[PDB]
Amino acid sequence: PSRKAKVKATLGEFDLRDYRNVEVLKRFLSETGKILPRRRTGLSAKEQRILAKTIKRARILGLLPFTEKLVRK
Amino acid sequence: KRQVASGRAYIHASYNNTIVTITDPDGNPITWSSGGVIGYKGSRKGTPYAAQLAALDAAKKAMAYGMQSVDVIVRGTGAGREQAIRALQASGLQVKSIVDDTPVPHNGCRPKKKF
Amino acid sequence: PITKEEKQKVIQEFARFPGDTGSTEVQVALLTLRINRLSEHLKVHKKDHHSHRGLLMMVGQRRRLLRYLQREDPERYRALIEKLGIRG
RNA sequence: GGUGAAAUGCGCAGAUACCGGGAGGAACGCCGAUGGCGAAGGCAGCCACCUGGUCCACCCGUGACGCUGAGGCGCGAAAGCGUGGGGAGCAAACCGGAUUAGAUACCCGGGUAGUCCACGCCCUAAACGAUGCGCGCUAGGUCUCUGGGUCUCCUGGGGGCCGAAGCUAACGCGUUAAGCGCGCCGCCUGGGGAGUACGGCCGCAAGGCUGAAACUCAAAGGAAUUGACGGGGGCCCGCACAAGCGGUGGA
Ligand SMILES: [Mg+2]
Ligand SMILES: [Mg+2]
Ligand SMILES: [Mg+2]
Ligand SMILES: [Mg+2]
Ligand SMILES: [Mg+2]
Ligand SMILES: [Mg+2]
Ligand SMILES: [Mg+2]
Ligand SMILES: [Mg+2]
Ligand SMILES: [Mg+2]
Ligand SMILES: [Mg+2]
Ligand SMILES: [Mg+2]
Ligand SMILES: [Mg+2]
Ligand SMILES: [Mg+2]
Ligand SMILES: [Mg+2]
Ligand SMILES: [Mg+2]
Ligand SMILES: [Mg+2]
Ligand SMILES: [Mg+2]
Ligand SMILES: [Mg+2]
């Protein structure tokens, strides 16, 4: 069911526009650098259109990765 | 020639072939092999039993240089992709970590007609 | 673009009493200002056809308030067409 | 490497795979959604700047100023031309290999135009909701984007699906009307000939716009129904095939 836990509840509050909040914005990527599908995140219609141009910001400034490779795990 | 403890396994699985070049912690070609070197001539080469075979004859040239440990890397989705991966755990070689890193554009080149 | 206070200017500099946020004249102006930051913005960005639109719905919208004034009083017109110096 | 299988092709002047550095062009993965915006063609990597449209709120302002528009003016994907740059990858024409009875194709390995930037042309399209443009009226239900509020819910603007009334040839439309009325526009008037000819008009050109007739046929059409049929699928059965025994075809 993909019914693990969306990342909206696994945190206190925060701002979606503070690019270098990388503790949080690591849990909005995958085991690739891919911005988590809206179903995983559980973000609003506004919210993940914001968190979109955020991790596109906090990428150019190196902080958050463009892609990874893969752990067979 | 020389001796090497830890070395890393590169696997390139196409459709018309599957290729294993094994190296050292830098990425330097110790021994390499694909199905077409095993004896396979045409469409023969892509079979999952060819991938099992390259990841033998390549991992055999590599114990010839005394190979102990391997980490694996794989490039593609192809016939018997993981059949070689297994063909290495089954050759007598510690499989460290196993990684996939497929060439993935972010949309640059228009592919050929045949998409 | 424009901000409140420069707007303020044209507004009160034009209004026929104080708090006439919009009479006719006001608007015949406000556009004149907007058209004109637009004539320029375009006079270099020649390939912005898209905004050329908005210009013309404004070139236009003016030209009616124009005639409206030509009709319901031609003096307050004579005075509004010198005070902005249009036609051409 | 490539395919159904293969050869042209590239490699013992060292290819592929493999690490590190470098240049150059073209696009922008995940977020990307039945989602947004725009008048339309059309538009998504990230930043700033110059701007256009638009919605919500308070109802403060002038006070019918409003609608539509023949012609004129401007915008208009893709290919196409013109001068000059650019050319990674794709790739008409073209060069080969394979398939086939033949293959000027489907499949494979190269290849100029061209796609890319500019600046001027070209000004067509299944340019498509195939529904020109405003306003007023007529059950609602859920979904979805976006505004405002005394946010259990109320109320604006959008995009979708199902349905009242009613329309409709039927399909289907269905408060995003193809429902009920008002204004204005352009357009149709049987199929072929034909988007041709004649003439004017536009462009450098390729061509476009406007646009007939003579003659010939009783049709050309639209939805919809029962079947038949598919190298369309879904589900069953027969010694239909397979698993087994024995023969014919030969004498
Ligand atoms: Mg490199
Ligand atoms: Mg479109
Ligand atoms: Mg009032
Ligand atoms: Mg009054
Ligand atoms: Mg009009
Ligand atoms: Mg073009
Ligand atoms: Mg040139
Ligand atoms: Mg070709
Ligand atoms: Mg050209
Ligand atoms: Mg151009
Ligand atoms: Mg054009
Ligand atoms: Mg035509
Ligand atoms: Mg239309
Ligand atoms: Mg609605
Ligand atoms: Mg009914
Ligand atoms: Mg319906
Ligand atoms: Mg006729
Ligand atoms: Mg039998």
Chain A: closest CA distance from residue B30 (Å): 23
Number of domains in chain B: 1
Looking at the DSSP bridge assignments, the partners of residue C43 are: none
Question: Is there contact between B109 and strand D, defined as CB under 7 Å from any strand atom?
Answer: yes
Question: Number of A:B CB contacts under 8 A?
Answer: 14
Torsion of CA C6, C10, C16, C20, to 10 degrees: -40
Kind of pairing, strands B6-13 and B94-100?
A: unpaired
Q: b/e per residue, C57-73, with b = 16+ CB within 10 A?
A: ebeeebeebbeebeeee
Rounded to whole angstroms, the distance from the CA of residue C75 to the C1' of nucleotide D72 is: 31
Burial class (CB in 10 A: 0-12, 13-18, 19+), B73: buried
Supply the DSSP string of chain A, one letter for each residue.
Answer: ---S--TTTSS----SS-TT-TTTTTTTS-SSSPPPPHHHHT--TTHHHHHHHHTTHHHHSSSS-S-------
Q: Are B20 and B33 in contact (CB under 8 A)?
A: yes
Q: What is the experimental method? A: X-ray
Tokens (6 digits) for C41: 């913005």
- CATH architecture of the region C1-88: Orthogonal Bundle (1.10)
Q: What is the strand order of the sheet B6-13 is part of? A: B31-34, B18-23, B6-13, B69-75, B94-100
Residue A40, CB-side half-sphere exposure with 13 Å CA sphere: 9
Q: Which CATH number goes with the domain that contains A51? A: 4.10.640.10
For chain C, the chains sharing at least 3 beta-carbon pairs closer than 8 angstroms are none
| Residue A22 lies in domain | 1-73
Domain positions in chain C: 1-88
Chain centroid to Cα B48, Å, comes to 12
Taking the C-alpha atoms of residue B77 and residue B98, their distance in angstroms, rounded to an integer, is: 15
Q: How far is CA C70 from CA A43, C2, C30, C67, C86, in A?
A: 57, 29, 19, 5, 14
Taking the C-alpha atoms of residue B82 and residue C72, their distance in angstroms, rounded to an integer, is: 86
Looking at the DSSP bridge assignments, the partners of residue B71 are: B8
SS3 for C84? Answer: coil
Nearest to B103 by CA among B2, B12, B7: B12
Q: Which residue intervals of chain C are DSSP H helices?
A: 4-12, 24-44, 49-72, 75-82
Q: Which CATH number goes with the domain that contains B76? A: 3.30.420.80
Taking the C-alpha atoms of residue B103 and residue B74, their distance in angstroms, rounded to an integer, is: 11
Number of domains in chain A: 1
Question: Is there contact between C59 and strand D, defined as CB under 7 Å from any strand atom?
Answer: no
| Residue B101 lies in domain | 1-115
Question: Is there contact between A59 and strand D, defined as CB under 7 Å from any strand atom?
Answer: yes
Q: Could you say which nucleotides of strand D lie within 7 A of any protein CB atom? A: 1-7, 16-20, 25-33, 35, 39-41, 45-47, 50-53, 60-66, 74-76, 88-91, 107-109, 118-120, 144-147
What chain A residue is nearest to B104 in terms of C-alpha separation?
A67
Å resolution of this model? 3.4
Tokens 């503070």 belong to: A18
Contacts with C46 (C-beta within 8 Å, 6 or more apart), sequence order: none
Q: Are A65 and A34 in contact (CB under 8 A)?
A: no
Question: Is there contact between C58 and strand D, defined as CB under 7 Å from any strand atom?
Answer: yes
